[PDB]
């Protein structure tokens, strides 16, 4: 360790811990002597390197700090780094650690500043030589490790990372910084970044993600693609390459505002199109929300393969997954042109093949009839909806439907909703149309209207491919000048097609909701359906919906409930992207009334989503402002004010709702806490605002797919017995439905207590009854989510009519809307080349353990179970495919997605 | 590496929670509404100043009770009748008024240091797949302990009563102690954990009272997992001979039968017992129908020893030197605590170098030391 001069290599290592005799004295003395000795210095460069390499073993700052202190000066004092231009430039290799020995391994603020700047210039100019690159490389792959180089190499990467970051914060850019003094531009430092990226991807993952973000463009990623598509096999395997790429896009959702976020996803889509797995490609094509990208991957498996092969059956499968049916429309029609087998392929893309598989599942589950049988007065009304709510999904109860006695004893709007609930017995089925027809040709126009509600609901499982499409039946009923008939017609259309854009559909829905000078309170449904068609895909921002909202508001204020639905319909229309929603926000804000201010805040939620952390605070300032104006005072209008108050409360929850799904699965825990204190802040403030906040909370959980599903609805239910609005119970059970009879047993008991124990009005009793039967279907027949089941951060379409209904106090008319329960998730199954109706095995986990992903990936251990299971909701959503020993290997990856499995035997 | 963004996302929401909560309190909390303000007027009428804790001896059903105070005078107290007359039971702590004593109210929870011992103060952050392997003997504790609580759904389908209890046993270092802590982390059911060596005291009769407490807390908390860590430490451990000894050991065993099921008919308690001496347990406890399936642990085989060593080397720095695959080969049907000790000792050999690369050489030196606890704590060495 001590000074025992220069003999063998051993005693030289111990000499240079104290003071080199072959680095500091020699290079300086030599350089300020002759410059013919530059040839001799060049030979000693290699000598200098070895002594550093030996002394990375040692873990102490001191034996580099003092030793090389005078060599750090010699760089500019004698060498100057330009005396014989190439010769000193190429000798800046040992000198780069020497500066850093004073930067990083010594902490003195005067010098921590000064040498950051020297280090940045000489990295840039010596990375032109690319010899700075090789210095870096031998230190990352080291010979020996210690604390010092582990903090020092982070300094090297940060000089580069730093400059680029400063050009966005400041307009000063390149060498006009005073904290680098070195540009990032040209091909002086740009060529340094590319080279660094290549080396650092290979052994680690270092500066690769920072480069993409700080450039902030689609360009930065397109440079990454070059390297990674090469590395896909020989360097590292396919599978691992996927895990880098998807980690980047999911991670940076809170970090890229709408146009920067989609621009990155262009390149992820592109890499996946290049690589093996075209199942990954299609999924990012939906994510962007482009029709165009869906088609290319669809052509990509289908066209080059001449025979029908597994490949066409796979193509139809990939498109079917979206229950929005954006993909369902696109993927059909390409098959008719090609002409293999039309009949199986087209059904498989549309939602008809999902009808077939539910039957096998249903045979196991059975059907339970335990629904109420009360007769006459209001007790008839409560019970006739409840039978439909016990049998949601595809079920059998034919004999009860034929029992027309209780159907006919309902009156009012009760008749409309009574027939509607009968339709939800055959929700997602073709068959049942015959029972509906009965009521359609007899007695009062009111039951006829209800038959149409059932047709819409049943049509969710059969419409795409333009096979028995809903439009066809329901158009005659839209035209009909009678309000009861028309309202039911367009409500059934809006559900049926969800996000599916089709032209006949679009143009029926335009002349309606463009004559909202007429006072029709059940013409909210006029805009509801039109809004839906946009959802799932890139927004048109139709000037028709915007136009009729402004006319409507001018014309009437007496129907505040109608204009309130319409305020939401606009924000629900704009879902499917968040880029376009920025323009229409200002268009909505251009007009200014206190009534127009209400409409603005709902749409601000939809626009700012997926970076909306400003949005949340903004809707809290909004809360202050009524009291703010009033304070000054304390020291026609009635409708307008009341709309103002309710929209604000709805908006606060809605903003949170969009955010928690899109921005990873981790924020979901925290935003649950925000809503509880939110109800608390309005509570024992203003009474009116409290009522609105109770109902929104239940659909907030249902929208976001909260992790814990036992505890929360049930705790909330007890507290809300005292407080007004039993409609809250309806919204809690939408969350509770989960895997049925896991949670849902406690829902029936609990909700049964608040209702059975105390009665105060037969109206309040009616709501409490309905909620109780909705939660279950027998033995987890179905699960409910808003998540797409292709993206787990996704959001649905068909569930947004449920999201509407928490806004307003209860009505018998609201009862008509709520029967819809679609957005079903299919029971996972392995479909062969003929389509087999049973799976084999699957892995289940409750949740992921991964801290390097956060959208959720199943681990590879799991607990194994048998076939014919419906995909368990939150608390079981991880699904892994099991079947590898039997040579069954999935083609269609599933990650707790809805997805229908497809497997190839060998 | 590169989980920074996930850390910042998480962090951001923490910042948003702090914000909203602070601002909400300040003039939008519950300060300006009459269903708080006028209710508390008449709440404070019959409340103090002193609120004089009592101990609830017995109730009388006329709205009175006989309390004995900590300050030693009895009171035959009334009960105001807004606190719900019969919602309070012996052992509750009662708020009595500064004047003539009425039960002003009733405190639910009064933290004793004796339920501190059972209750957790730390989270067992190693959960499923950090005890990885024994994936065939984790289907007898996550198909009968974890899973019925998570899903009563599957057990409604078969009907009958859900699984009750398990007993874990096998050779030391098969992860037995941590398995239990890893299923209770995930369910988030009420985790009581009691050591086997605290049931035995050098005081008599208050041993069984401690054990009796543990299950009353479990029955009071509906989802319940009680880890009794070590109940081989009841037949090898004794103090004095007048308050430990045989008599104490018999009493405690019998108390535990009544608690676990006996006659009580209490709330669903899953019991998890670590033991490796299975004749310190009653012939009324190792019959099933209290403990249903029994779990045997053997030392993990070679491909299971790859999984055990893979938990440990994600934390280890790695080199082109390192050869994991030969570290498993020398070990033959050995425990997962040897593999856990080798890597911890391999990092001790790295630290001595003062280097941060852990190589194959550091693992193999530590492997010979780990097998030295099996050949030289044996003084015969090679079997004589």
């Amino acid at each position: 360790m001590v000074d025992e001069s220069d003999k063998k290599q051993q005693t030289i290592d111990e000499q240079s811990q104290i003071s080199p005799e072959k680095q500091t004295p020699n290079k300086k003395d030599k350089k300020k002597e002759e410059e013919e000795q530059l040839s001799e210095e060049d030979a000693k460069l290699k000598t200098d390197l070895e002594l550093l390499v030996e002394r990375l073993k040692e873990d102490d700052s001191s034996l580099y700090e003092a030793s090389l202190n005078a060599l750090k000066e010699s760089i500019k004092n004698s060498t100057s780094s330009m005396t014989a231009v190439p010769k000193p430039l190429k000798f800046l290799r040992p000198t780069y650690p020497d500066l850093c020995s004073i930067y990083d391994k010594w902490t003195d603020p005067n010098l921590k500043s000064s040498l950051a700047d020297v280090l940045s210039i000489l990295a840039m100019t010596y990375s032109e030589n690319g010899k700075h690159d090789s210095l870096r490389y031998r230190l990352l792959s080291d010979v020996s490790d210690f604390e010092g180089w582990g903090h020092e190499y982070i300094r090297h990467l940060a000089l580069e990372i730093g400059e680029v970051y400063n050009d966005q914060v400041e307009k000063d850019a390149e060498d006009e910084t005073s904290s680098d003094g070195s540009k990032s531009d040209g091909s002086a430092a740009t060529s340094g970044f590319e080279f660094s990226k290549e080396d650092t991807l290979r052994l680690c993952l270092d500066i690769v993600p920072y480069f993409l973000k700080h450039n902030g463009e689609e360009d930065a990623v397109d440079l990454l693609l070059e390297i990674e598509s090469i590395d896909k096999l020989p360097q590292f395997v396919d599978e691992n390459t996927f895990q880098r790429v998807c980690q980047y896009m999911v991670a940076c959702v809170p970090l890229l505002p709408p146009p920067e976020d989609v621009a990155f996803l262009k390149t992820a889509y592109s890499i996946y199109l290049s690589q093996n797995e075209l199942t990954d490609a299609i999924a990012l094509a939906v994510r962007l929300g482009e029709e165009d990208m869906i088609r290319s991957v669809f052509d990509a498996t289908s066209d080059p393969v001449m025979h029908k092969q597994l490949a066409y059956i796979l193509a139809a499968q990939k498109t079917s997954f979206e229950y929005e049916g954006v993909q369902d429309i696109i993927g059909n029609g390409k098959l008719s042109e090609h002409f293999l087998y039309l009949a199986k392929e087209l059904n498989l893309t549309g939602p008809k093949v999902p009808e077939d598989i539910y039957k096998s599942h249903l045979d196991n589950s059975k059907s339970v009839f335990s629904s109420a049988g009360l007769d006459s007065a209001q007790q008839n009304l409560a019970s006739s909806f409840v039978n439909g709510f016990l049998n949601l999904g595809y079920c059998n109860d034919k004999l009860i439907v034929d029992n027309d006695n209780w159907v006919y004893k309902t009156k009012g709007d009760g008749m409309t909703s009574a027939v509607a609930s009968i339709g939800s017995i055959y929700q997602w089925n073709l068959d049942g149309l015959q029972q509906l027809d009965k009521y359609l040709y007899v007695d009062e126009p009111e039951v006829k209207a209800g038959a149409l509600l059932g047709i819409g609901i049943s049509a969710s499982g059969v419409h795409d491919g333009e096979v028995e499409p809903a439009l066809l039946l329901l158009q005659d009923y839209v035209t009909n000048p009678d309000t009861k008939i028309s309202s039911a017609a367009i409500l059934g259309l809006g559900i049926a097609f969800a996000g599916s854009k089709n032209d006949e559909v679009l143009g029926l829905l335009l002349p309606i909701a463009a004559s909202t000078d007429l006072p029709i309170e059940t013409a909210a449904m006029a805009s509801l359906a039109l809004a839906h068609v946009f959802v799932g895909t890139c927004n048109g921002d139709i000037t028709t919906s915007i136009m009729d909202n402004f006319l409507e508001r001018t014309a009437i204020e007496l129907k505040t409930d109608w204009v309130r639905f319409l305020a939401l319909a606009l924000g629900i229309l704009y879902m499917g992207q968040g880029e376009q929603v920025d323009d229409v926000l200002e268009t909505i804000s251009a007009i200014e009334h206190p009534m127009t201010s209400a409409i603005e805040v709902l749409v601000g939620s939809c626009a700012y989503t997926g970076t909306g952390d400003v949005l949340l605070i903004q809707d809290l300032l909004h809360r202050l402002t009524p009291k703010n104006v009033k304070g000054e005072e304390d020291a026609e209008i009635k409708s307008e004010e009341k709309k103002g108050k309710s929209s604000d409360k709805d908006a606060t929850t809605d903003g949170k709702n969009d955010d928690e799904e899109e921005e990873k699965e981790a924020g979901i825990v925290d935003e649950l806490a925000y809503a509880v204190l939110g109800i608390a802040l309005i509570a024992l403030g203003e009474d009116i605002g409290k009522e609105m906040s109770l109902r929104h909370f239940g659909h907030l959980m249902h929208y976001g797919n909260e992790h814990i599903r036992r505890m929360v609805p049930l705790a909330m239910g007890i507290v809300s017995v005292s407080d007004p609005q039993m409609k809250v119970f309806d919204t809690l059970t939408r969350f509770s439905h989960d895997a049925d009879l896991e949670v849902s047993m406690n829902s029936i008991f609990a909700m049964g207590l608040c209702g059975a124990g105390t009665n105060n009005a037969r109206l309040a009793q009616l709501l409490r009854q309905l909620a109780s039967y909705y939660s279950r279907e027998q033995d987890a027949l179905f699960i409910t989510r808003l998540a797409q089941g292709l993206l787990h951060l996704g959001k649905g379409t068909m569930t947004m009519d449920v999201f509407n209904d928490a806004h307003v106090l209860n009505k018998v008319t609201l009862a008509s809307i709520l029967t819809t329960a679609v957005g079903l998730v299919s029971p996972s199954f392995m479909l062969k080349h003929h389509q087999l109706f049973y799976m084999l095995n699957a892995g289940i986990r409750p949740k992921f353990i991964l801290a390097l992903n956060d959208e959720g990936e199943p681990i590879k251990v799991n607990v194994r179970v048998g076939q014919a299971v419906e995909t368990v909701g939150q608390a079981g959503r991880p699904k892994k495919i099991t079947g590898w020993i039997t040579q069954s290997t999935p083609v269609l990856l599933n990650h707790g997605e809805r997805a229908e499995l497809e497997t190839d035997e060998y | 590496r590169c989980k920074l963004k996930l850390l910042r996302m998480e962090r951001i929401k923490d910042h948003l929670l702090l914000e909203e909560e602070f601002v909400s309190n300040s003039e939008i909390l519950k300060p300006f509404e009459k269903k708080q303000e006028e209710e508390k007027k008449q709440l404070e009428e019959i409340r103090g100043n002193p609120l004089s804790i009592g101990t609830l001896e017995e109730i009388i059903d006329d709205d009175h009770a006989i309390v004995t105070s900590p300050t030693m005078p009895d009171y035959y107290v009334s009960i105001l009748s807004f606190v719900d007359k019969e919602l309070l039971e012996p052992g509750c702590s009662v708020l009595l008024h500064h004047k003539t004593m009425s039960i002003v109210g009733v405190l639910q929870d009064d933290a004793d240091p004796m339920v501190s011992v059972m209750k957790m103060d730390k989270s067992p952050t190693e959960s499923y797949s950090d005890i990885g392997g024994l994936e065939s003997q984790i289907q007898e504790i996550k198909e009968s302990v974890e899973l019925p609580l998570t899903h009563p759904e599957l057990y409604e389908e078969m009907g009958i009563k859900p699984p009750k209890g398990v007993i874990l046993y096998g050779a030391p270092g098969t992860g037995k102690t941590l398995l239990a802590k890893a299923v209770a982390n995930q369910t988030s059911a009420t985790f009581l954990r009691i050591v086997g060596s605290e049931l035995i005291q050098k005081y008599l009769g208050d041993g069984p009272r401690l054990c009796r407490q543990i299950f009353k807390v479990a029955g009071e908390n509906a989802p319940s997992i009680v880890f009794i860590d070590e109940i081989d430490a009841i037949g090898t451990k004794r103090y004095d001979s007048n308050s430990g000894g045989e008599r104490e050991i018999q009493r405690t065993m019998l108390e535990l039968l009544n608690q676990l099921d006996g006659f009580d008919d209490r709330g669903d308690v899953k019991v998890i017992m670590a033991t490796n001496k299975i004749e310190t347990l009653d012939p009324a406890l190792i019959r099933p129908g209290r403990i249903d399936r029994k779990i045997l642990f053997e030392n993990p085989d070679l491909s299971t020893k790859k999984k055990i060593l893979g938990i440990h080397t994600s934390k280890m720095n790695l080199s082109e030197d390192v050869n994991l695959e030969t570290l498993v080969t020398t070990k033959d049907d050995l425990s997962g605590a040897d593999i856990q000790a080798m890597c911890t000792e391999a990092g001790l050999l790295a630290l001595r170098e003062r280097r941060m690369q852990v190589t194959a050489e550091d693992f193999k030196q530590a492997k010979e030391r780990v097998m030295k606890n099996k050949v030289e704590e044996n003084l015969e060495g090679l079997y004589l």
């Binding site: 903090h151 940060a158 993952l205 920072y210 | 590496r1 590169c2």
Partner: peptide
Amino acid sequence: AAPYAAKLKQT
């Protein structure tokens, strides 16, 4: 040692 390892400690 990656350039992020330094900054995970602070978050």
